[PDB]
């Protein structure tokens, strides 16, 4: 699972888009999405 303050899954990011329990994949920027 993607860690806190890391990029979870934005446009172009291929990988584990599911964040760790309690952290939410928030799309901050068009490509930058972060697990908060
Ligand atoms: C890998 O997966 C990511 C998932 O967000 C895509 O954005 C990318 O285009 C590729 O399919």
UniProtKB/Swiss-Prot annotation:
Protein origin, superkingdom: Eukaryota
Chain segments annotated as transmembrane: none
Domain CBM1: residue ranges: 1-36
Post-translational modifications reported in the UniProt record: N-glycosylated. The catalytic core domain comprises three N-linked glycans which each consist of a single N-acetylglucosamine residue. O-glycosylated. Within the linker domain, all 8 threonines are variably glycosylated with between at least one, and up to three, mannose residues per site. All serines in this domain are at least partially glycosylated with a single mannose residue. O-glycosylation of the cellulase linker provides protection from proteolysis. Linker glycans also contribute to binding affinity of cellobiohydrolases to cellulose.
Sites where a glycan is attached: 1, 3, 14
Subcellular location: Secreted
Disulphide bond pairs: 8-25, 19-35
Domain statement: The enzyme consists of two functional domains, a catalytic core joined to a carbohydrate-binding domain (CBM) by a serine-, threonine-, and proline-rich, highly glycosylated linker sequence.
Further information: T.reesei produces two different exocellobiohydrolases. They are unique in that they can hydrolyze crystalline cellulose in the absence of endoglucanases.
Protein task: Exocellobiohydrolases (CBH) that catalyzes the hydrolysis of 1,4-beta-D-glucosidic bonds in cellulose to release the disaccharide cellobiose. The degradation of cellulose involves an interplay between different cellulolytic enzymes. Hydrolysis starts with endoglucanases (EGs), which cut internal beta-1,4-glucosidic bonds in cellulose to reduce the polymerization degree of the substrate and create new chain ends for exocellobiohydrolases (CBHs). The CBHs release the disaccharide cellobiose from the non-reducing end of the cellulose polymer chain.
UniProt family annotation: Belongs to the glycosyl hydrolase 7 (cellulase C) family.
Name used for this protein in its record: Exoglucanase 1
Species annotation: Hypocrea jecorina
Classification lineage: Eukaryota, Fungi, Dikarya, Ascomycota, Pezizomycotina
């Amino acid at each position: 699972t993607q860690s806190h303050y890391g990029q979870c899954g934005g446009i172009g990011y291929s990988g584990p888009t599911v964040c760790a329990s309690g952290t939410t994949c928030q799309v901050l920027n068009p490509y930058y999405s972060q697990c908060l």
